[PDB]
Amino acid sequence: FCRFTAEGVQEIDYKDIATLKNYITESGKIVPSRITGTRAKYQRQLARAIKRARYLSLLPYTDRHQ
Amino acid sequence: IALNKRARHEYFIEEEFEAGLALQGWEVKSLRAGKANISDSYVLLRDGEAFLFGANITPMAVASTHVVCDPTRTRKLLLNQRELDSLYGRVNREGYTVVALSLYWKNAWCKVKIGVAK
Amino acid sequence: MRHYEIVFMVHPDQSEQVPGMIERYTAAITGAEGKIHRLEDWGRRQLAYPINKLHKAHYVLMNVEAPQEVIDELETTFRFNDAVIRSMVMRTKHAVTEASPMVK
Amino acid sequence: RKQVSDGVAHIHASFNNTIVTITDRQGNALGWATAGGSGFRGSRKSTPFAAQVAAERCADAVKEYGIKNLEVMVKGPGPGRESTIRALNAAGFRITNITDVTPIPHNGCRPPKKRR
Amino acid sequence: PVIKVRENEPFDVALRRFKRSCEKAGVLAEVRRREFYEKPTTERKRAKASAVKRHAKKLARENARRTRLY
RNA sequence: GGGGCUGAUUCUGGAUUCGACGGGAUUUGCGAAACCCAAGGUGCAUGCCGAGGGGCGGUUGGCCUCGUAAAAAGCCGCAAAAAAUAGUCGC
RNA sequence: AAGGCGGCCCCCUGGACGAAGACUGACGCUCAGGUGCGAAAGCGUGGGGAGCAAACAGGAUUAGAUACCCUGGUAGUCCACGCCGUAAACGAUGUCGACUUGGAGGUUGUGCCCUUGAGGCGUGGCUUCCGGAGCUAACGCGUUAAGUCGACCGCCUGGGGA
Ligand SMILES: [Mg+2]
Ligand SMILES: [Mg+2]
Ligand SMILES: [Mg+2]
Ligand SMILES: [Mg+2]
Ligand SMILES: [Mg+2]
Ligand SMILES: [Mg+2]
Ligand SMILES: [Mg+2]
Ligand SMILES: [Mg+2]
Ligand SMILES: [Mg+2]
Ligand SMILES: [Mg+2]
Ligand SMILES: [Mg+2]
Ligand SMILES: [Mg+2]
Ligand SMILES: [Mg+2]
Ligand SMILES: [Mg+2]
Ligand SMILES: [Mg+2]
Ligand SMILES: [Mg+2]
Ligand SMILES: [Mg+2]
Question: Where are its TM segments located (chain A)?
C-alpha cells in the first residue's frame, strides 16, 4: 500500500516537508520499509529527499539537537 | 459502488450484520465519479461505538482539496442496542480484522454489510 | 546546457538586500544567453537547528537553465558572499514550470 | 545564596557508576551525588538501588534552594536509567520533561577492541 | 526522545511512556551495539547468520505445523 | 440566439440510513435514595465521623471492616508477531 | 570483471539492461608467453595525527603468564606520489555456448488489458531459498548444475622432506 504508487508520483520532491515528516520519526530517524510498506525504489528516493531536507534544515537531524 | 482488493485474495467471512455507516453528503460529487474505495475499512468497536478507521475520501477531489469531507474519516454503524452489545463483547478484547462486503444503497445512503474475517 | 536548481538561505538581518540578489543573479544568468524558469522568495522561516548560531533564515528558490561555467561562477559568488549561509545547487533532468509544494 | 526555582537534573548512568547532578536552567551545577560515594565500592554500585540512594543524597543536597520544578536529562545505558528518576519522584520536585540525551555518534570515532 | 508530562497523568504512567518510547527508538540497543568495534567481517557474518535464522524459523514453523503431533 | 441534461427517490407523498450515539415530551410496567409508607421483613440499633487494604504503581473519595490502636474485597501496564546474566583445569 | 564500493552536492566517466525499428554481415570463442588492475599488513618521500592501536611500560590473575583482563601508549590507520603482487583473493565451483520437470520470494525495466481502487494477463535481465529426474564416495549441486554436451586454457599423480 505504498502511497507513492497509490498517488502515481513520478519523482519525489524534497520540499513536501509534511509528507517527509510522515516518514521521519519521533527522534528524527527514518522509518524503514518494514514499518511503512514502501517499495524500495521510492524508499531510496525518499531517503535522498530526507537527506536534502536535513542539509537544508527544513527537517531536523535529531529531535534532541540544538 | 466499490470493493476492496486487500483481503479479496484472502479468506471468507463468518458473520453478517446490516451495519452501514451514515456517510455524509459532503462527498456526493465524489460518490458519483466511479473511483471506488472501501479500502482499509477495519472497524474497531469500543466506548466510541464502532469507530471505523481511515476511510480514504475518493481522491478525485473536486472541492479544491482543502476539505471535501475529511482526508480520512472515522464513523460509526447502524445496529441495535443489543446487537452492539453482542458485537461489543465479541470485538472489544482482540484487535480483530473486519471489513465491508459491498457498497450499494437502499435509495438513501451508502450501505455497508460488515463482517469479521478470521 | 543543463537544468540547475539553486535554493539558498540568507542571514535574516540581510533580508532586504535579497531583492538585489534576485536582480543581480538574474542579470548574471541572463547575460550568458541562458534562460531562467521559475523564481520564488519563500520569505523568512524558522529553522530546525541553529545554522551558524542563527534561528531564522530567508529562503530563495530558483530553477535555471544555464551553462556550467556561469553556474560555477554563481557557486563561488555564493561561497564568497557573506549574507548567504547555505546554498544547494542540484542538477535536475527536467526544467520545472509549476509552483513549489511549500508555498501552498 | 541565590534561591532559584527551576532546576535541571543530569543522570549519567554508565555501565559501572551512576551520577546525579542537579544543575540550574542555565548550566551551573548546584548539587550532585554519586552511587559510588553513597556507600558502595566495586560490585554494588552497578545496581539501581545505589542509583536511588544517590538521588536521595542529592535530594538532601538541594532541599534548600527551593527547587519546585525539575526536568530530567538521562544519559547512557546501565542500571539507573529508570530507578533514579523513580527516586526523584520520591524526592518530590515536579518533573516536566524526561529527555534522553545519550550521545550516539553517527559512525564517528572508532570504538575500542572487543573484550575477549 | 524529549518527552513532556501532560496534566492528569501520574508519574508512573509518564515514566512508562518514556520507557517504551526510548526502548522502541533504540538507545540501549544502539549503545550496546556501538560499545565495541564489531569488525566488518563479523558485521557481515552476524547479519548473514541472523538472516539465516530469521528465514529458517519463518519457514520451519510451517514445515513443522503441516501435520498433527498430539 | 433559444430548447433538452445534475433540484439525485415515473410525486398529489408520511422515515423508509427498522432500531445508531445524545434528544425536548407522554399512558403502560418494576427497584427506597425512582417512592408516600411500616417497627410492612428484621434488633444491642441508626444518619453523619475517622482510618487502613492484591509480587509494584494507579483507580472506587469509597467496596470491606474496626473504636483507643492497625487487618480480609472488583479492574489495568509489568515482551511473547525477531529479545533480559557469569573468573579458577597443568599433566 | 576481481579487489571492492555506504551522509549530501557539483564536474569528468565507464559499464549494464529494457523497448520498437534500422544497420554491418562471421567481424566469433578461448588464449601459452606478454601486459594491466589487484583488500589488508609492509616499504620509500613529504604532510597530517582526534579516535583506535601492534612494539613498549605499569597493574593484576597465575605455579610461572613475555597472553587473555585493566591504565597508558609509539608505529600504523589517513592525504598525494610511487614500490611490493600476497589472502580461507571462497561459491574452496576457469571462461564461453547450447538443451533439460517446478515452486517460493526479492530486485530492475517493459508490452497488453478497463492501471474501472493499493489489480490482472506476459516477456526480458539480475538475484536468494526449497526441491524433481539426473548425478554424486556421501554430503549435497540441482535451468545461475556438481545434469546431458561441445571449444579452448590451467592444474594433480601417496603423506611428510617442501
Ligand atoms: Mg572498556
Ligand atoms: Mg611435563
Ligand atoms: Mg547486408
Ligand atoms: Mg599469463
Ligand atoms: Mg596500506
Ligand atoms: Mg608509510
Ligand atoms: Mg619497520
Ligand atoms: Mg612519516
Ligand atoms: Mg596522538
Ligand atoms: Mg596463492
Ligand atoms: Mg573476498
Ligand atoms: Mg566468500
Ligand atoms: Mg583457489
Ligand atoms: Mg561424469
Ligand atoms: Mg537444492
Ligand atoms: Mg558442466
Ligand atoms: Mg563431484
Answer: none
The rounded distance, in Å, linking the Cα atoms of D18 and D75 is 10
Residue matched to cell numbers 475499512: B41
| Cell reading at B83 | 446487537
Cβ atoms within 10 A of the Cβ of E35, count? 14
Burial class for C27, CB neighbours closer than 10 Å (0-12, 13-18, 19+): exposed
Q: Do strands D18-23 and D29-34 pair parallel, antiparallel, or not at all (unpaired)?
A: antiparallel
Chain A from 1 to 20: CB within 8 A of any B CB:
1, 7
Q: Residues near C32 by Cβ (< 8 Å), separated by ≥ 6?
A: C66, C67, C69, C70
Q: Rounded CA gap, D83 and D75, in Å? A: 13
Q: Which helix (H) or strand (E) holds C92?
A: strand C84-92
The three three-digit cell numbers of residue B36, written as one number = 471506488
> Measured CA to C1', what is the nucleotide nearest B76?
F20
Q: Which residue has the cell 540581510?
A: C14
Q: Are A57 and C86 in contact (CB under 8 A)?
A: yes
Q: How far is the CA of C72 from the C1' of G83 (A)?
A: 39
Q: Are A33 and A43 in contact (CB under 8 A)?
A: yes
Task: Using DSSP, state whether B55 is helix, strand or coil.
Answer: strand
- Alpha-carbon Rg of chain A, whole angstroms? 12
The answer to whether E22 and E28 have CB atoms below 8 angstroms apart is yes
- Name the structure determination technique: cryo-EM
Instruction: Using the structure, give the distance in angstroms from the CA atom of B85 to the C1' atom of F78, rounded to a whole number.
Output: 30
Final resolution, Å: 3.7
